[PDB]
Amino acid sequence: AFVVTDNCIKCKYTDCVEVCPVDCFYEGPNFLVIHPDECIDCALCEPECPAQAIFSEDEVPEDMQEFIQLNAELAEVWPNITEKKDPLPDAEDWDGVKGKLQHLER
Ligand code: SF4
Ligand code: F3S
């Protein structure tokens, strides 16, 4: 599975979903997650993220390992998203800020 990590929070550009062949992204208020059972590891979304927030799970940074289980858990509760929409309004101010998990909204 590919995993969405920290920099997606408060950016949520959603470019990643246009390229997903199996529609396995699920939508929260200010973050997206990949459903690990659905992902076919095609790696097509990883170059599309402007925030460079998607990683193969075997390449998730050490300080972002929490995101693996978070994607698995929230994917089970959030609605499926299959079409790109506009980025959050201040996405570029928050792109690159570290430690945005304290801002995640359920
Ligand atoms: S690696 Fe492929 S199947 Fe998995 S979320 Fe990305 S685009 Fe979808
Ligand atoms: S910012 Fe998030 S919504 Fe997709 S394009 Fe990147 S993983």
Structure description:
With 106 residues, this protein is of the alpha+beta class. It has one domain (1-106): Alpha-Beta Plaits, CATH 3.30.70.20. 17% of the residues lie in helices and 11% in strands. It is built from 3 helices and 4 strands. It has helices spanning 16-19, 66-75, 91-94, and strands spanning 2-4, 25-27, 32-34, 54-56. The protein has a two-stranded antiparallel ribbon. It is globular. The chain binds iron/sulfur cluster and FE3-S4 cluster.
Tell the overall outline. Answer: globular
Distance between the termini: 22 Å
Q: What is the number of beta strands?
A: 4
**Which range does the strand content fall in?**
5-15%
Q: Tell me the count of domains.
A: 1
The CATH class: Alpha Beta
Give me the Rg, rounded.
12 Å
How many helices? 3
Q: Strands of the largest sheet, in order across it?
A: 1-4
Helix content: 10-25%
Structural class: alpha+beta
PDB class: electron transport(iron-sulfur)
Keywords: electron transport(iron-sulfur)
Assembly: monomeric
Entry title: crystal structures of oxidized and reduced azotobacter vinelandii ferredoxin at PH 8 and PH 6
